[PDB]
Amino acid sequence: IAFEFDGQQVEAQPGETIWAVAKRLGTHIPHLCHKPDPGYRPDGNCRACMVEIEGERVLAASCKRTPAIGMKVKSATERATKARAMVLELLVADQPERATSHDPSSHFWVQADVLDVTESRFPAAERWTSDVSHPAMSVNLDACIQCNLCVRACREVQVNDVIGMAYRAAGSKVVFDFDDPMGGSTCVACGECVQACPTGALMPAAYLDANQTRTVYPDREVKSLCPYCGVGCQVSYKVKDERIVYAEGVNGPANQNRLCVKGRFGFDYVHHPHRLTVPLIPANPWTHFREATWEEALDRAAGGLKAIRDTNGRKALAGFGSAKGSNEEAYLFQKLVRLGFGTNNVDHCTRLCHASSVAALMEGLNSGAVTAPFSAALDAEVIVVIGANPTVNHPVAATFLKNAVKQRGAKLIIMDPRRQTLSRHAYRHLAFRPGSDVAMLNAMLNVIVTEGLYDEQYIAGYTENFEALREKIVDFTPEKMASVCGIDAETLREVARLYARAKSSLIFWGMGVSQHVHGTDNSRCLIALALITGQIGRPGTGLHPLRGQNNVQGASDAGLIPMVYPDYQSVEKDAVRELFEEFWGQSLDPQKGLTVVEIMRAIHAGEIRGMFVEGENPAMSDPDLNHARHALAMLDHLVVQDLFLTETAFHADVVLPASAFAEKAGTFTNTDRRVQIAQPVVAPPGDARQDWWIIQELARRLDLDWNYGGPADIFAEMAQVMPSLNNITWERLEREGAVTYPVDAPDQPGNEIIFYAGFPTESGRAKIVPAAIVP
Amino acid sequence: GRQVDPHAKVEIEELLGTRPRQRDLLIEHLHLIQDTYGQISADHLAALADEMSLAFAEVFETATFYAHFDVVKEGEADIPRLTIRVCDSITCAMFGADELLETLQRELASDAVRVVRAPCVGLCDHAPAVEVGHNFLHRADLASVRAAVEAEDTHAHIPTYVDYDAYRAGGGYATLERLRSGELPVDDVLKVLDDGGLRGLGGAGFPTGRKWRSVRGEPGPRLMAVNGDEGEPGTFKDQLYLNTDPHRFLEGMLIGAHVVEAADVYIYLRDEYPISREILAREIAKLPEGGTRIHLRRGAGAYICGEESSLIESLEGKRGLPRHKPPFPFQVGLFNRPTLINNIETLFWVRDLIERGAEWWKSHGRNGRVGLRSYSVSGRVKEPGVKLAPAGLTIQELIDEYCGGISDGHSFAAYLPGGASGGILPASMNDIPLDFGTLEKYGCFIGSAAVVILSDQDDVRGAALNLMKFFEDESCGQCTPCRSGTQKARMLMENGVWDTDLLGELAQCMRDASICGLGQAASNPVSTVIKYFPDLF
């Protein structure tokens, strides 16, 4: 589009409201009420971005209009400047003294200094008081410019339906539910309105004091991510010398500038006073067998393990693991075992939950990765969900879904006994007694084929077993399971029509289903909805369960498993044990390891001797009491590398100073197939250190002689084997930040959808599995 | 954690029974609550929302923007059942209102009763305009309200009018039935409406044939609506017609609907016009099931609803906030679909256009201008009330020919057309014709035919102050110029003298940088005073 501007004949792209054209061109002008960051929407209230155009008689706006053909805009004139200056004069007239107030170095005062205004000539208004009911925030609301961004953040993006302007013009204010103090309001501490209010009214704590006023600037800044969920919410940590304060979101392709309570607050664990800095081998403060040292308590690990190996054997050893806070360590936390102990007795107390899922996924497709991402539910048309509560444990995705509901109207469905928050936004709600989902699941399974509304073509050459099952299937029916599940049939006829007829669809769930004994048998059927209908492997289609940790993918995809080395190349195979050794130069053990509960119940009156624990509180995770106290009691030589003196390893005969999260580089992954880089902020206290040094030193003390160096080379030595990253390097994992592994080309965004043209399985097809009611 | 749905949810399902629960249908529920109970309490809102499955923020935003719904929480004090209101605009205030307020607010302002302010109710003709719970008064005074309260005279009182049969006696819905039949096609109607020059009423000054052609050219399922707010102070026409012969207006509306092919229609008039709210509900049920279904809605305050986009958002059960003008109302409307608005007056005349023609609408104008209009005179005259007269008429002739005169004891100093939106001019501006496109070269205009007359005994600056107070309380609250400029003007105009230069700047700003057509006019009065009253500074 061609249109004149300030005396030029310039061009503009489409959807480029005048403001953006000026910015791109270098003629910045004030907005105040228009947050250009992706995610928001303009409203045109402040009227500070006004311009002139030949043809109209009333001035216009620059954030809400568009430069159609022939038009010509004007900013360097008189009317517009006078109007802007007058608006700013009014605002600063109803404003406090910027000398000492809330956020003196803010957006409003900057845009004022641009229009050359310091004071005003109008009087004040004698406004209202403040409320500090909520601990983190501080609403000293005497600087409200009525910019309505609080709302577009709490009523349009991080949807929780709390804020709203509930009065008339002069008395117009912002209020929480029923004019309540917001200390017990529906606010969930979702800090998307705290970084949108330009003025310091809607401001957090830690940036001001009793006589509410700014008291600090950013000492420094660092861009990182959150070690609490499995989404990879980026962050920019606000620091002061040996102090961390508060963070904001960044334009991360996974988060998109929106966090939860923990992206803002709740990290008092890192700098938590009561901590550990030296070996210490009951009350919290260490009081027994403490001997600060770094060559004694490492002899007492290397020599101990080596000698007990010699005297009792290799299989007599065992080892737990962890993935809470690192990836590259696991590569080594397992290489160490496989080399010095010559034994595949690894385990993973975090992969326990969602095992059945990946079991079925590799049975049917030879993979365990959620088909396609969750941030792609905005081009779809339908949703499915069962056994979960995203808003709580995976909120960001929940609000993505809410936004998709709002904008595009794409319906969803629910499957849960109790009532959930999303109900309000939910198109339906299907309660049922537990351990019975599979019934209505088969109903939906066979509703399609029995009526005859399936997509034969996709089932023609892309999924085998389509005919051998039909005996039980046509034997089954979607009308019989009412008293067995607790629903009516027409609902199910509908739901299935909806899915199969829908242009696209997805399904979500979590540990709620796979928690049951035969949750496998649940997914054993859920697998094929997208496959039997075809709505898979294409934009907006796929299957995508969720995980409850940071990089469990990154751990259990790079060789922390009792039956397989990284990138899912099992041990029982032969060639696996013939090519890995050109790198590790060792003789391995083909027989599998003893799984977590297997090894635990084994050692109980068993034969294993000691282990090398790490990043876990096993004493209180899976087993209630029997395998917590008596578990390690009979053990002889023990190790614990925990940050704190957690309840577990109360008698762990040696300890090391686990480094916290916020201090490291490396690589992390999410439940989205993406790998996120990190970066350190603050060194730890005491003589503590990281783990990629602990394990290096211990390998050396155990006659391994790796001497690789730093993680920036562990990455390469871990990728040289795993083709999943066949085109990746730390360089572009720093620049461009995060990426996902299934990509093929170097200078391309990525390949982010399973089965776009064919399964990566030997046959190219799946093996649809017999799904029976097998209690 | 949050406001909880209490056990007090029985009285919300035992009171709505079998009704629809669409967002667009909310205000009726709130009115129902405010009627059955004299207040609207939180618990009830929580129950209502958790029924409609909404959030407390939305219902709270809506239940307080309209100036009538009275809200309370578990902490505040109970509201009484019996209340009254008083007018505070220019006309009702010129006859001794404020003294009335502060005179009866300490005799019968006790617990069981209440007394508050009110902008205007459409009775500028019979001076004070007091109301007692859906019952209005005239020439109000203390010794009359005493008796009106002591006796349970809260209920309204209905006059006589023309029913369906008496109307059917004459032409009686024969012009309409000629359309469902091909006895006369459409194009003729457009052609008469065009060549006859029916420049529409309302404060727009816009033709009608063009609107109808346009809304007829755009596709899909069409709609329509009517604005019966008439909230502008010096405007009391709609009442004198809806209370004498509505069936003519219904004829016109059905005509204007079938042409655009609108399945259903909508209506919107104040809460301060109850008599009509009963006349209609009495008549409609007698109008047969023809094939076009009609509706009827209420409205609580919100003079900003006189605007189109705000009326749309209200009929959508939303907050009364207008929209931007580059995307037009005839392209995207009531439910994101086309719809044509038309004031009841513009409909009331169509029958006389068709049955007689256009020439009957051209042999009327007195001065160069042409047309025929229904003025609304008020203030210190001798025979006030609505008036029909050829457009293009001066004001002196409107005073000494139709209105009988001015008074016996006063004189003529100032006057103001266009009600509040318009300006206040002196006598010397006497030889000017009163039409649509004639006064824009003087600062003011005439949008609603509102007229007022002030004498020497009356002061102008106080009138401008009252108008600015009105515009301050009727502001929607979105655009900054109105929200803050109205305050700064209500303040600057308070002191013994105002600068008028800061005021000129502020007026230029508000007139060039205001979203709605209200802020574009709230500065007309002060500017006209600065210009044509150079002897008051």
Ligand SMILES: Nc1nc2c(c(=O)[nH]1)N[C@H]1C(S)=C(S)[C@@H](COP(=O)(O)OP(=O)(O)OC[C@H]3O[C@@H](n4cnc5c(=O)[nH]c(N)nc54)[C@H](O)[C@@H]3O)O[C@H]1N2
């Ligand atoms: N706050 C928080 N968040 C976390 C974690 C945490 O400890 N705390 N841990 C992370 C990880 S990896 C974990 S351990 C997860 C756990 O968290 P989730 O994955 O959410 O599992 P639940 O929290 O139990 O939610 C499962 C949902 O299924 C419902 N449900 C209950 N019974 C059944 C049933 O019989 N069938 C079905 N289909 N659904 C049922 C539950 O009531 C709930 O609605 O959270 C992850 N994120």
Ligand SMILES: Nc1nc2c(c(=O)[nH]1)N[C@H]1C(S)=C(S)[C@@H](COP(=O)(O)OP(=O)(O)OC[C@H]3O[C@@H](n4cnc5c(=O)[nH]c(N)nc54)[C@H](O)[C@@H]3O)O[C@H]1N2
């Ligand atoms: N009460 C309760 N118990 C449960 C569950 C539950 O919901 N409630 N769910 C079960 C399930 S599914 C799960 S998902 C488990 C998880 O429960 P746990 O097995 O306790 O795992 P976490 O609670 O994450 O504890 C991880 C340990 O690693 C330490 N750590 C943290 N960051 C780092 C780091 O960067 N490096 C190292 N080396 N260590 C670090 C932590 O301080 C802590 O000691 O809980 C299981 N048990």
Ligand SMILES: Cc1cc2nc3c(=O)[nH]c(=O)nc-3n(C[C@H](O)[C@H](O)[C@H](O)COP(=O)(O)O)c2cc1C
């Ligand atoms: C702030 C504002 C308030 C208005 N209030 C009313 C009103 O109360 N009644 C009315 O009929 N028109 C009112 N109008 C003018 C509307 O545009 C009018 O109702 C509508 O355009 C009628 O169109 P018509 O001329 O075809 O009949 C108002 C306009 C503005 C800008």
Ligand code: SF4
């Ligand atoms: S809270 Fe922020 S966005 Fe809301 S009115 Fe105040 S300054 Fe404007």
Ligand code: SF4
């Ligand atoms: S929860 Fe967070 S985003 Fe939502 S309203 Fe409260 S502060 Fe704003």
Ligand code: SF4
């Ligand atoms: S979802 Fe988890 S990782 Fe992401 S921002 Fe929230 S707490 Fe942090």
Ligand code: SF4
């Ligand atoms: S600023 Fe004034 S004219 Fe504009 S929307 Fe608000 S009340 Fe209406």
Ligand code: FES
């Ligand atoms: S700045 Fe874009 S209109 Fe307010």
Ligand code: FES
């Ligand atoms: S009643 Fe005061 S003028 Fe309308």
Ligand SMILES: [W+6]
């Ligand atoms: W988990």
